Structure 1
Amino acid sequence: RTTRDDLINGNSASCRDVIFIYARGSTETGNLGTLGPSIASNLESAFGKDGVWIQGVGGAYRATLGDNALPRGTSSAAIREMLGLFQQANTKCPDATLIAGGYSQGAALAAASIEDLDSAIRDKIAGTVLFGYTKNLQNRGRIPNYPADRTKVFCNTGDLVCTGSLIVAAPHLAYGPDARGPAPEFLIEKVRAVRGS
């Protein structure tokens, strides 16, 4: 359940209405890690298995712990990978609504990619969820160039990465309940806000 490549594998003649692009945390497995599968199962319940495509950021994004210390909180090669997935979604399925998320290094990766993304494409991302956002203090709880109303940050009390450090303490590992409930709830609401139901 930790690898989903629905966008890469998906038929362009049978596009999903909703495409979710997710970046995992440092040292996590597959391309969805620990929190992505819980988000994915809740999105599939809301939109149906053919209504949503789940795509993790794999390829050149190796989720290397040491890359947290680089200027943007991840590597340039990882940013290029996630940018290329947003570009693939826009080309393959131009009428799909996009949603995004990330955890830890993956939250820095999502923020950096969304910042650098061409606005035609960025403006199709109806909502973004960030868990354990390592650039939370530096970016003042925002993704640069992206509206606050479409952003939801989950930053636990005592998660030191949310207050400008790179120390991993116990509250950084405690986002499971958010991934099961509030995070897919937010993403579903932001998709329905623009698409109806």
Structure 2
Amino acid sequence: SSTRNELETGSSSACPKVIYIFARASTEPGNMGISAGPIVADALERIYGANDVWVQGVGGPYLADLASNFLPDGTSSAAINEARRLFTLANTKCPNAAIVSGGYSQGTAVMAGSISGLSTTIKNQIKGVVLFGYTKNLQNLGRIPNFETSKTEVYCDIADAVCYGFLYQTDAAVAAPRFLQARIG
């Protein structure tokens, strides 16, 4: 459940309802990690059908190392390009799937940096984005640059220091799936 590649591996003859793309926290294993990621993946699969959700982690060159949190974008440029690559693949393979996405900690910076740079038509296919412990919360004014704020939800705990420039279990299991579901329609 730490590694999910249903989008890379998916065929455009079998497009699902939902494509879910997740960027993990620093240090987490796989491309999904072991906290926020799998929890949102399971909630979505419960709502829509395991067969009607493609779950996809941002792996490849997104190494999730701590040092990269200090780069100007809060992550590496290769992690950002890999998330872009993946959203782009979702749109080429399945232009009608609802794309939803999530990030936890540094993955939050992968989500904000990739989405802010994508085309109008790709961003339109992204129906919802959930950010858990958003490391660029203050810098980005609680939103993703160039992406509609009604589609964005930030879970930023009062005691979460990264939010001022595992605390999110009920956010991930309960509040995030509902937010996403309200917009997948």
* TM-score normalized by the length of structure 2: 0.97
Secondary structure in structure 2 of the residue aligned to 1:53: strand
Structure 2: give runs of 5+ residues left out of the alignment: none
* Per-residue deviation, 1:147: 1.1
Q: Does 1:187 align with 2:154?
A: no
The correspondence of residues 147-186 of structure 1 with structure 2, limited to 5 A, is 147-164=148-165, 173-186=166-179
SS at match of 1:15: coil
Matched, 1:5 2:5: yes
CA displacement, residues 67-113 of structure 1 (integer Å, 9 cap, x when unaligned): 01100000011111010001111111111111111000000110110
Contact 2:95 2:125 (C-alpha < 8 Å) held by counterparts = no
Give the Cα–Cα distance (whole angstroms) in 2 for the partners of residues 13 and 81 of structure 1: 24
Deviations 1:173-194 (A, max 9, x none): 21112111101111111101xx
Give the alignment of 1:65-84 within 5 angstroms.
65-84=66-85
For residue 127 of structure 1, what is the aligned residue in structure 2?
Answer: 128
Which residue number in structure 1 is paired with residue 30 of structure 2? 30
Root-mean-square deviation (CA), in Å? 0.8
Separation in structure 2 between the aligned mates of residue 9 and residue 189 of structure 1, nearest angstrom:
27
Measure the CA separation in 2 of the matches of 1:185 and 1:94: 23
Q: Secondary structure at the match of 2:153?
A: strand
Distance 1:129 1:150 in 2: 9
Identity %: 53
SS at match of 2:51: coil
Aligned residue for 2:21?
21
Deviations 1:109-168 (A, max 9, x none): 10110001111101111110000000000111010011111111000011110001xxxx
Distance (whole Å) between structure 2 residues aligned to residue 127 and residue 54 of structure 1: 15
Which amino acid letter does the alignment assign opposite residue 179 of structure 1? A
Query: What is the CA distance between 1:2 and its match in structure 2?
Result: 1.0
Deviation at 1:29, TM superposition (A): 0.6
**Does the residue aligned with 1:98 lie in a helix, a strand or coil?**
strand
**Which amino acid in 1 is paired with 2:172?**
A
Encode CA deviations 1:10-45: one digit per residue, 9 max, x unaligned: 121111121011100000011111211111111011
Amino acid at match of 2:128: G
Task: Tell me the matched-pair count.
Answer: 184
Q: Counterpart of 1:14 in structure 2: which amino acid? A: A
Correspondences of 1:35-46 after superposition (within 5 Å): 35-46=36-47
- Structure 1 length as normaliser, TM-score? 0.91
Aligned to 1:138: 139
Paired residue secondary structure (1:80): helix
Q: Quick one: which amino acid aligns to residue 82 of structure 1?
A: A
Where does residue 195 of structure 1 map in the other structure?
Answer: none
- State how far apart, in whole Å, the 2-side matches of 1:189 and 1:107 are: 21
